[PDB]
Design an enzyme around this catalytic site. Structure first.
Site, mmCIF file in Angstrom:
data_model
loop_
_atom_site.group_PDB
_atom_site.id
_atom_site.type_symbol
_atom_site.label_atom_id
_atom_site.label_comp_id
_atom_site.label_asym_id
_atom_site.label_seq_id
_atom_site.Cartn_x
_atom_site.Cartn_y
_atom_site.Cartn_z
ATOM 1 N N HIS A 1 32.391 33.002 71.357
ATOM 2 C CA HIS A 1 31.130 32.739 70.640
ATOM 3 C C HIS A 1 31.398 32.124 69.263
ATOM 4 O O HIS A 1 31.076 32.683 68.214
ATOM 5 C CB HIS A 1 30.304 34.013 70.516
ATOM 6 C CG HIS A 1 29.673 34.445 71.803
ATOM 7 N ND1 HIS A 1 30.144 35.504 72.555
ATOM 8 C CD2 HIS A 1 28.624 33.927 72.496
ATOM 9 C CE1 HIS A 1 29.400 35.633 73.642
ATOM 10 N NE2 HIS A 1 28.473 34.686 73.630
ATOM 11 N N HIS B 1 31.329 26.718 71.265
ATOM 12 C CA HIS B 1 30.332 27.170 72.235
ATOM 13 C C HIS B 1 28.957 26.607 71.890
ATOM 14 O O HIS B 1 28.290 26.021 72.745
ATOM 15 C CB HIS B 1 30.291 28.698 72.286
ATOM 16 C CG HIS B 1 29.130 29.255 73.059
ATOM 17 N ND1 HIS B 1 28.921 28.993 74.398
ATOM 18 C CD2 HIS B 1 28.109 30.058 72.670
ATOM 19 C CE1 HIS B 1 27.835 29.626 74.802
ATOM 20 N NE2 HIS B 1 27.323 30.280 73.776
ATOM 21 N N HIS C 1 21.983 29.177 68.206
ATOM 22 C CA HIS C 1 21.566 30.366 68.942
ATOM 23 C C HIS C 1 22.559 31.520 68.895
ATOM 24 O O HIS C 1 22.171 32.623 69.295
ATOM 25 C CB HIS C 1 21.274 30.000 70.398
ATOM 26 C CG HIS C 1 22.500 29.843 71.228
ATOM 27 N ND1 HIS C 1 23.286 28.706 71.197
ATOM 28 C CD2 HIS C 1 23.089 30.696 72.094
ATOM 29 C CE1 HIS C 1 24.317 28.879 72.010
ATOM 30 N NE2 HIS C 1 24.202 30.060 72.585
ATOM 31 N N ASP C 2 23.804 31.302 68.467
ATOM 32 C CA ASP C 2 24.787 32.381 68.328
ATOM 33 C C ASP C 2 25.322 32.505 66.902
ATOM 34 O O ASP C 2 26.428 33.040 66.699
ATOM 35 C CB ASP C 2 25.957 32.187 69.304
ATOM 36 C CG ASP C 2 25.686 32.765 70.694
ATOM 37 O OD1 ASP C 2 25.059 33.825 70.848
ATOM 38 O OD2 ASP C 2 26.170 32.170 71.666
ATOM 39 N N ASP D 1 23.087 27.781 77.898
ATOM 40 C CA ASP D 1 24.003 28.837 77.441
ATOM 41 C C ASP D 1 25.115 29.123 78.453
ATOM 42 O O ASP D 1 26.229 29.479 78.054
ATOM 43 C CB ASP D 1 23.192 30.107 77.142
ATOM 44 C CG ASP D 1 23.827 31.011 76.077
ATOM 45 O OD1 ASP D 1 24.838 30.621 75.446
ATOM 46 O OD2 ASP D 1 23.297 32.130 75.873
HETATM 47 C C1 LIG Z 1 29.409 30.672 80.501
HETATM 48 C C2 LIG Z 1 29.790 32.105 80.747
HETATM 49 C C3 LIG Z 1 29.181 33.138 79.886
HETATM 50 C C4 LIG Z 1 29.545 34.399 80.134
HETATM 51 C C5 LIG Z 1 29.077 35.604 79.406
HETATM 52 C C6 LIG Z 1 28.128 36.442 80.242
HETATM 53 N N1 LIG Z 1 27.605 37.565 79.514
HETATM 54 C C7 LIG Z 1 27.584 38.851 79.993
HETATM 55 O O1 LIG Z 1 27.062 39.769 79.385
HETATM 56 C C8 LIG Z 1 28.194 39.181 81.299
HETATM 57 C C9 LIG Z 1 27.339 39.769 82.197
HETATM 58 C C10 LIG Z 1 27.796 40.131 83.438
HETATM 59 C C11 LIG Z 1 29.108 39.914 83.773
HETATM 60 F F1 LIG Z 1 29.586 40.271 84.991
HETATM 61 C C12 LIG Z 1 29.961 39.340 82.862
HETATM 62 BR BR1 LIG Z 1 31.749 39.097 83.416
HETATM 63 C C13 LIG Z 1 29.523 38.964 81.608
HETATM 64 C C14 LIG Z 1 27.147 37.342 78.164
HETATM 65 C C15 LIG Z 1 28.149 36.595 77.320
HETATM 66 F F2 LIG Z 1 29.231 37.393 77.046
HETATM 67 F F3 LIG Z 1 27.565 36.279 76.138
HETATM 68 C C16 LIG Z 1 28.633 35.336 77.984
HETATM 69 N N2 LIG Z 1 30.435 34.632 81.150
HETATM 70 N N3 LIG Z 1 30.892 35.822 81.547
HETATM 71 C C17 LIG Z 1 31.707 35.486 82.549
HETATM 72 N N4 LIG Z 1 31.776 34.148 82.802
HETATM 73 C C18 LIG Z 1 30.960 33.636 81.915
HETATM 74 N N5 LIG Z 1 30.629 32.342 81.705
HETATM 75 MG MG LIG Z 2 24.266 34.719 72.422
HETATM 76 ZN ZN LIG Z 3 25.559 31.458 73.578
#
Ligand SMILES: Cc1cc([C@@H]2CN(C(=O)c3ccc(F)c(Br)c3)CC(F)(F)C2)n2ncnc2n1
Ligand SMILES: [Mg+2]
Ligand SMILES: [Zn+2]
Length: 342
Positions: free
Chosen positions: A81, A85, A121-122, A233
């Site tokens: 983040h 990103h 956004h982050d 995102d």
């Molecule tokens: C582009 C992209 C972005 C995210 C994450 C997903 N996010 C989660 O909470 C999450 C939820 C359930 C899961 F099973 C997992 Br694993 C993570 C939020 C975040 F961390 F902001 C970004 N991931 N995660 C794994 N490949 C990703 N690719």
């Molecule tokens: Mg975010």
């Molecule tokens: Zn983001």
């Protein structure tokens, strides 16, 4: 003084044509993380110019240059983040504008707010999730935990603080009504990046896709903005396998760092943040199947030209199945040593 010289060039050198950034820059197959970070603020201006938001909203060039640099400066450097990103999320917004004919669905000001929201956004992400703010009793939780979406509220508040910094309000000539519109859009769009919000509105998104987008339906505009934001995102997953492999590396580095901190506090982390329990192929398959793939299926249902995005996310999910066996240690480790057993 570093931002001062970067500002001076940004303002006085001119806005490079978007095609001079890369020849495939406007294609769904371009990977914006390929762009050197030093070139990204100019690329933001190039995209804003190409979508004609600079001319249409008469954005003051000094103000816009300061704004873009302040947004970049508002990101820290956790593994995932970070500003790169936010840059890649913004680029995908640009791709949606260039490929999906958003002007048939959304007002100009909504598309502009989507892009600015992507940039912001982050903002000031510390590499930990919302639950961690509560459990750690952070300042952010003190401020926002009663409302939910702690980090996303912080991201929005940081965006407003940049606008409220002298010389940075790119909207300060808008009419009172348009200004209020823009900031309300930014609130809604940034808050929609909380995946808990996505999961809450998912059925409404399905129902909108089923009945058909009604451009005269103001709730349909709001739902579509949420879906587009989430699509931006997660858009790393729409690229080639090598991009998604690297992005998984960054995600789990960030997650496992949070989990180490939770264990140091006496708290059991989520499995996906526990480096002793997380089984990455299974977690990625679950993320792709239950979160990422349905999002891009919805996007395809609404925009048939988005089909290739869903196919790529599906292909990447099947790739995790194909490489899962490599997480099992066959034979001896490379060093021929079983020392890791102790
Ligand atoms: C582009 C992209 C972005 C995210 C994450 C997903 N996010 C989660 O909470 C999450 C939820 C359930 C899961 F099973 C997992 Br694993 C993570 C939020 C975040 F961390 F902001 C970004 N991931 N995660 C794994 N490949 C990703 N690719
Ligand atoms: Mg975010
Ligand atoms: Zn983001």
């Amino acid at each position: 003084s570093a931002m001062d010289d970067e500002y001076t060039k940004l303002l006085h050198d001119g806005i490079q044509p978007v095609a001079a950034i890369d020849s495939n820059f406007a294609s769904f197959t371009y990977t914006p993380r390929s762009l050197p970070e030093d070139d990204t603020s100019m690329a933001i201006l190039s995209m804003l110019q190409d979508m004609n938001f600079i001319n249409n909203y008469k954005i003051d060039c000094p103000t816009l240059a300061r704004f873009c640099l302040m947004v970049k400066k508002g990101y820290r450097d956790p593994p995932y983040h970070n500003w790169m990103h936010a840059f890649s999320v913004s680029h995908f917004c640009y791709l949606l504008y260039k490929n999906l004919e958003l002007t048939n669905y959304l007002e100009d000001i909504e598309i502009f707010a989507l892009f600015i929201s992507c940039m912001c956004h982050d903002l000031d992400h510390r590499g930990t999730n919302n639950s961690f703010q509560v459990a750690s009793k952070s300042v952010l939780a003190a401020l926002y935990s009663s409302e939910g979406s702690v980090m996303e509220r912080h991201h929005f508040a940081q965006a407003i603080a940049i606008l409220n910094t002298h010389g940075c309000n790119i909207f300060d000539h808008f009419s009172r009504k348009d200004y209020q519109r823009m900031l309300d859009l930014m609130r809604d769009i940034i808050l929609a990046t909380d995946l808990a919000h996505h999961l809450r509105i998912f059925k409404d998104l399905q129902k909108m896709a089923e009945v058909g987008y009604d451009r005269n339906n103001k709730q349909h505009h709001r739902l579509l903005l949420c879906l587009l934001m989430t699509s931006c995102d997660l858009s790393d997953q729409t690229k080639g396998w090598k991009t998604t492999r690297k992005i998984a590396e960054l995600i789990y580095k960030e997650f496992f760092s949070q989990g180490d901190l939770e264990k140091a506090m006496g708290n059991r982390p989520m499995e996906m943040m526990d480096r002793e329990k997380a089984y990455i192929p299974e977690l990625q398959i679950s993320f792709m199947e239950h979160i990422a793939m349905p999002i891009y299926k919805l996007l395809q249902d609404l925009f048939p030209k988005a089909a290739e995005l869903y196919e790529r996310v599906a292909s990447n999910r099947e790739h995790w199945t194909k490489v899962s066996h490599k997480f099992t240690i066959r034979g001896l480790p490379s060093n021929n040593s079983l020392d890791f057993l102790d």
